[PDB]
């Protein structure tokens, strides 16, 4: 239940704006679709028994994505993992025969699952599984296999509870807005001039004294209105009074009946205040500040090509750490399906990972725009430390520590470059 | 009903300005008509049985656009999808014979449709379908086929409800204007000087005391007016009094009758306030801030050709994600018409998508102006790392990682470039 | 117990943001995963009996990481060491036979361990060890071997107690926030204009005097509201009153009934105050200030490649000192397993360390970007002091004190560079 109230407030963090902008900053590059290029490949770079089995996984893996319908439904499944604070896929298998094998993976609403042996609470009717039939309103129990349970790997203030990654920004977000209601509340109110009219009546009953109040309304009450639909001043057509005229009569021989205007909202503020808490909520999100929240006029800095800051570089790391947590949602539908189906056993799997890397695709554009500053500097070094490359540092030695190549890259290239010189078209 | 009240407030978000400017920012490039060039092509880049069937779709697809009348009615159907939060096209088929096949797709008003099996509520009389005749005022039921239902793929605060994409900006928009009425309300009011005239009368009945009030009006009341039609001061022709003169008589021997001017609207503000909430509503829209809301005098930054920022680059991604949601409105009138008509069955279709890409056309101008900075930098690298292209990195190796070409592009070109040299006109 | 309350407040330092940002600044580079490259290698650069035993450790050490599951669970085990202020791994061995040898290392919750002979307090049921069975709710005692106990090597104010490294920043952090509640508390309150209405009633019982108060509410009470869900003004549709009108009646012939508005929150501040304490908490963390907390517009400074400051250089030192404290968590599961298993005895081990260095991997990117300024300056010297290299300083002499090489590097290179000149491709 406490688990369930938590995934509420996270999802009412997304409801608000900016949090939505910054969270979908991440999911926009924590799994980035590109044209032609694929997302979430199964890099196999480890000792495997057959050249056929290592490629056989594609029959398994390029298909296990289909069940998630991952190609058009990925950046929601992940954006759910991250913001939900948990994500459960129920697994239908099989019912028979074994090694058929398996069936569609259906997402489960977090907040309807308890884990002490998974207790799926059912709101309304969701599914009939293999058998016997669709349960209704009852807590159905599913074993800790096979259900993929991927959690944001966070301990929390007191062990052991699951939290994040939005948590650290919940308190900050609740008090950035607690200013935006304050800043409009100050201005809305007092926007209209208010006036308190004190008129006195001594020694007359409230029954008939109020009659001396019914007369100062029906004679001097103001109907002037401003409507936000069309900005016109209703019941005042046409033109505007150059000036007003209110007429009060202090019945006694003393100055007690008067209008005292209540204060106008003088704008002393001076508002560097909210501008403080917005930079907070933004640091608390985990999104780099170099995304442009500020107007950032010009300046410019300046440079023709924006460089890799350490900010942005950090964040790629935060991401590629995420992807390695959401890595889970691929490896336990696969491994239980690659055991259900046959081939490799569990006792063989243990040694392979180790490394059976799942490569997410990065953004094609900033792979280049990063690898262009790396290579820009390595050539700038190399031109600079060039007249000495004959005299002090070998050619091989610079090529491998100024260019940061490796040996078999120089080997491969040295052989290759021979035919370039045979003969056209670069012979000058 | 709640669904229907929602699509109301979205459409009363468009009513306002800026929201209109920013929403039609999107639809201006989420489907961009250009001259000569076509919009919404059916890219077929997958294994298909016949060279004739893959081109046969044009008889199907270049015609399925006609039913939407998409060529002159596209940027409204989409601008409706996006802002409506839903979009339904009823499908007329057939009534007979099968594979005729089909008929015009008629848009349905959202807010008159309920989905639990589609319940089309009818306001007035809309259509007679194939049979039997035009229903009037009654909830007619249409099966979940065949009606194309395209929704903005959003879960909302509580599952499962449909929202967006305008939602996040609804609250912000309602309180940017709640300031613009405040800022005029402060100024309209008090624009005219108001004066409260206290004149006293002790120990005379209100019946005859009011007669001592009828005399201070008919002698000193001001008729001076300013009319907004023509800015002249009515009943004051010609010239303007150099100064005024009001005459009051404190009947008692004490200072109780007087004019107290009510405060003037002193402009202390100091208005960096609304300028806050307009930058909000604008971030909440999803339109990049680099569109020029600000005056942006000069500066300049400066550069002769405006570069691709990361802002703008992000947004192209947000768009091409939309287009892939509005992709739906093409593939289920087509697939149900490509099964109605014959040829490919449903069991064959499942493997094709996968990929049967629907290419929207981008803006011709900024394809270039982007592909000009990419290529500007790749040549700038290539000139810079040129003296080493003989010595360290092969020609092939640079051509494929400094220019980012591919092999069959170099293959194709190497063969091609031979005849350029045979012989004119570039031989110098 | 005091030990246990301490590890509470540290973990409620992490709960807060920024502390989380700065602590994971460290762990992001106190153990940095990289692709392909490994983390935590066992550098053996000392006299060892066999060429086989020195590599035999990998069977031992590349496996002792597996028990920690260090490859995907490292930057949590360390981030726990640092923030917890202690970290205990219980060691399961064996139960028989000896030299089997050993079993999984299970993390222990700090706050449930007392050391005077380790007293593991058990909350609920955690493990059954080899025998006899899982204890419940009782203080089980484990000998000071074998349990790895790694502490942040800090003495504290009074010897001998364990503290840090977060301690110095606890007081500062508790009073940066004691301002952020102050700064919103000032603004929240008074955000709404408050008015105190004094109305008088002399010589009437409180039983019936309150009836003269029930009437000024039900006639003049204001229901105008602003709701933060949707920013609209509830019960006020449509448009906004241009102005207000409140009507009070001083029953006596004297000015005693009136509205006195309570002060508005004038924003004199002038807030360079919190901006003070945030720079404190940030210096107290130990994270360099050159990470970009400030907006840091432009300027720029300027340079195309950001240099190694002395700040950043210091911090690498603070880190590599940490890693040498967390070095412990590798060497006592290894040495007790390399004695349990056999081979080297304790009397042999004493001489080896000395040096049996455990190399953490640094960040691949800033090894380069540091080693590029070092080498940039050594060449800049060398070009500058070049015409004299024939006349005054030898070639050997400059090569070894301008380039900072060593002899066997020049030896090795001089031999190598001969074949470069035999003959292609650099012969110009």
Author numbering:
A (entry chain B), B (entry chain A), C (entry chain C): 70 to 185, 205 to 516
In the authors' words:
Tailed bacteriophages and herpesviruses translocate their genome into and out of their capsid (or ‘head') through a 12-fold symmetric portal protein assembly (or simply ‘portal'), located at a special pentameric vertex of an icosahedral or prolate-icosahedral head. The portal assembly serves at least three functions in the life cycle of most of the tailed phages: (i) it initiates head assembly; (ii) it provides a platform for the packaging motor during DNA packaging into the prohead; and (iii) it is required for tail attachment. In this paper we describe the cryo-EM structures of gp20 portal protein at 3.6 Å resolution and the empty prolate T4 head at 10 Å resolution.
Of all these attempts, the construct gp20-N74 (residues 74–524) was found to have the best solubility and to give the best crystals. The final three-dimensional cryo-EM reconstruction had an overall resolution of 3.6 Å, based on the ‘gold-standard' Fourier shell correlation (FSC) using the FSC=0.143 criterion. The T4 portal protein assembly is dodecameric and has a length of ∼120 Å. The monomers can be divided into separate clip, stem, wing and crown domains. The clip domain (residues 279–358) consists of three β-strands and helix α6. The contact area between adjacent subunits of the T4 portal assembly is 4,100 Å2. A bent helix, α8, is 30-residues long (residues 399–428) and is connected to the stem region (residues 255–278 and 359–377) by the ‘tunnel' loop (residues 374–398). This loop protrudes into the central channel of the portal assembly and has lower density than the rest of the structure, suggesting flexibility.
